[PDB]
Amino acid sequence: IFETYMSKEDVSEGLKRGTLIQGVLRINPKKFHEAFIPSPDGDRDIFIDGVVARNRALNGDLVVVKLLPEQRSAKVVYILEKKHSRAATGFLKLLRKYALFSPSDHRVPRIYVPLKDCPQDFVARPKDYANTLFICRIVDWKEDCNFALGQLAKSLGQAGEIEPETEGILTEYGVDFSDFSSEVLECLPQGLPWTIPPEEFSKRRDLRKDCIFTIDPSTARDLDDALSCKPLADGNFKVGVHIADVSYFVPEGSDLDKVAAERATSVYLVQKVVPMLPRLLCEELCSLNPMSDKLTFSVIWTLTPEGKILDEWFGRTIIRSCTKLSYEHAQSMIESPTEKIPAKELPPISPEHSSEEVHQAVLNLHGIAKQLRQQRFVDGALRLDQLKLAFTLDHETGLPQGCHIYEYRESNKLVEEFMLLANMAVAHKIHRAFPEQALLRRHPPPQTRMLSDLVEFCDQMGLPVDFSSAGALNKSLTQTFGDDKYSLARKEVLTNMCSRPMQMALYFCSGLLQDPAQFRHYALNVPLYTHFTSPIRRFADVLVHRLLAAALGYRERLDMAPDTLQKQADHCNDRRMASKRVQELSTSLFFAVLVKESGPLESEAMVMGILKQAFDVLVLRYGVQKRIYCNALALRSHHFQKVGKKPELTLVWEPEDMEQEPAQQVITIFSLVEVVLQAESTALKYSAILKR
RNA sequence: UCGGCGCCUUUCGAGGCGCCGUUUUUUUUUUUU
């Protein structure tokens, strides 16, 4: 039996007086008996122990708590906002009136389902339904039942496959993967051979004779932006960034606008993509495909060879892109400055231009982008880059064949510098035009509480890093380690440790925050930032397109209050967090399937934590973090000692032959060991075990 | 996250309830998909 909720008037009175504390619940995944909310006063979190103490609140709910008398313990007494999807994936068992549902997630409780929802052959023959995934939605949880009451949605398929588990994590996280109704496709233009209307040749600047190109990955269906560079007659360059004009095709108030607003970010998975607009807009009219006339919104600068701004112009234009490069052709043209590249390895080009113009254009943009990068990192930019893996999937069956490591070459930096310049320029324009309403991004500084713990950790172990600032933090991590096999692994382990206390970046509206100190982006060390570029994938990028066209005098001022923009910003934030979690879980699923169907995988590892009877490794080749126990090891003994706050584990192994003396192994932090990954009898679980 | 012990339900694939002994949760920024 749980405890009943309280009235709304008492909640409001105690929340305005200050006796009750609101906050977002966070639930430990590894152990499900404890939860934490952030304190408003100080840094350290408020403890909520047990399952009874938190009244029917799931992970992510925005709850209202009351502190227990005598780090600080509280109990949930009200729920303002229900932010959890109230859905789960799991298995059904015949415990009569009900049937039991056990979710895979251990934070979701156990669910009673009536036998009308259960299938027709479950009551007598339930043995074939012990490996079959079901989706169940909680509709009611009583105050006297330890089990929620649920409605069974459907049958996914066999557990351990690719598509049942994919649809399970999409439904559990709230991603709407359904189809578009006919009232949404009726707002699209109805002319299949679409052409530019002749009244749009006077309000826009015509750039159909320039050399404009796109650099995007080989597996790309939507192209948002294009670049151009031109050498001037006094040793300067005219650099232009061109973005697809999406807000011309999405009118305000139409059903397309509400549907696009409902799912803010597109979701990218390993095998497919859940879009935000219909296929017609995303892959035909809006996308900047080669040799077609497109309506764009563009920014043009005049830059010195070191990359300093002398002129600036915003405005609506009409372009025609000439080629579509990749991140691999651009790297070839970067790495071959004095030698002509043969036409066999190049994508097709419009006959108006030559490949020499594209070649010298990407060379000049590389020359400017190098100096912009160096100056930005002298000024104090911070960059904690971890390890990401990419898969090769078989075409017919859809199973993974092998994983490799995604490498950040120079062509990924060429684009990243010009996009960072266009975003900061547009942020300055729409902030000085409309101070009351503007959409901007902010990153708070990291938490002082566990930055002090990382400082006292690196005070030991002979590491001279410093965490006083952001540029100091980046220059210290780059200079101390250097380049070596043991050193690069040291860098990876410290990047994983340093990436832990950083906070998360937020969208916000400028009419609610009072001081300009909080408008600052911490990691990039700039005072204003906004996402003007790439609109097809995000909806805040279309809100910024409307604001900038109102500021330039092309239309009337926006009629939205400063609170409506804040509500839309909160929706875009939660959609971007759920999308990020979904992509991480999809990569983890495909790796577990690869380990099971590719035998044992042999690699090296670096210890990053040591406990009394177990230790955590980080597999260097794959980047996954697994825990190793001594019980699965054929060893005579192991001893744990603490020497100068530097733990030590000594393993005395068992000799295969009695005559040969038993070897010894000493394990401390930053030690290189060898591990093997082996699948086990459960469908999607594996383990890592030490070798020799 | 477990280690040990006791009990119950199994189609042997394992689950669930207690008693001790452990250990208080944060994985972020950038660009293109």
Author numbering: 49 to 118, 230 to 254, 263 to 859
Question: What text comes from the article?
Answer:
Dis3L2 independently degrades structured substrates, including coding and noncoding 3′ uridylated RNAs. Unlike a number of structurally similar homologs, Dis3L2 can degrade structured RNAs independent of external helicase activity.
We obtained a 3.1 Å structure of wild-type HsDis3L2 with hairpinC–U12 in which the double-helical stem of the RNA hairpin is clearly visible and nestled between the two CSDs and the S1 domain. At this point, when the 3′ overhang is 12 nucleotides long, the 5′ end at the double strand–single strand junction moves toward a loop in CSD1 (N76–H81). While the true start of the duplex (C2–G21) lies slightly closer to the S1 domain, the U1 5′ overhang forms a wobble base pair with U23 near the N76–H81 loop in CSD1. We observe a steeper decline in the koff starting around 11 nucleotides, which could reflect additional stabilizing interactions that become available when the phosphate backbone of the double-helical portion of the substrate is brought into contact with the enzyme (as was observed in the hairpinC–U12 and hairpinD–U7 structures). When the overhang is shortened to 11 or 12 nucleotides, the RNA duplex engages with the enzyme, stabilized by contacts with the S1 domain and CSDs.
